[PDB]
Please model this.
Amino acid sequence: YLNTQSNHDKQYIGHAGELRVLSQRIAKNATEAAAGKGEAFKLLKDARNDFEKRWNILVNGDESTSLPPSPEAVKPQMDVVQQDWDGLRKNADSILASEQTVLSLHQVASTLAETIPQLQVEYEEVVDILLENGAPADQVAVAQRQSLLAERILGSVNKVLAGDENSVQAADSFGRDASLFGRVLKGMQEGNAAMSISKVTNAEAVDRLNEIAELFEFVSGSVDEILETSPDLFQVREAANNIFSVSQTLLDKASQLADGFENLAGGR
Model:
């Protein structure tokens, strides 16, 4: 393709041009990766490394084409592209470094979005059971509240995935609501005097409380990873947001570097 006879100017201008393209591509994949899109991690890594390869050619030369370091005329343009690139790269490395956390958290949320509605369904079965078999009104009302509390646990999940200002308290809410839910479940199964929950004894209801309790194993099992690692989700969302802003200024400094090169290639 290119070699030692290849024109030096077109190399400076093409590399600088391609940094414009690569800055958009780093920004698009940084934001999609922060949103859990697993494929975007590879594309982010590749565009980040493409940029680094081209930037190093502009700074130190390309040995394989005997392209020298860039002229000192464009040194001020280079110097300012370098500050933005340093920022772009550090943030994108922060995102790439959290790939497993981000993808594991989204896996947990994906299955939670299936099992929690199933909890809701079986508790409203339990509501119908206790109601229509004349079971005591206090068991009915607890089951009704258990149903709505499962919905509130689910609602905390997306708020965690946002990775915004509120996501870490959404994750505290998830865990507290899940604690109350598990305690009220055991209280319906075994009785709980401290909280005034009567042991349910309708056998059909008891059947569906045991299925509920088995589904709930995954919700309660997910509480630790949500608490521990949801701050990561905020960090990578912040890094992607930084990426976008540095991306836009780098787009402009890169167009000026390209313009400086094209000027030298015409005397100006």
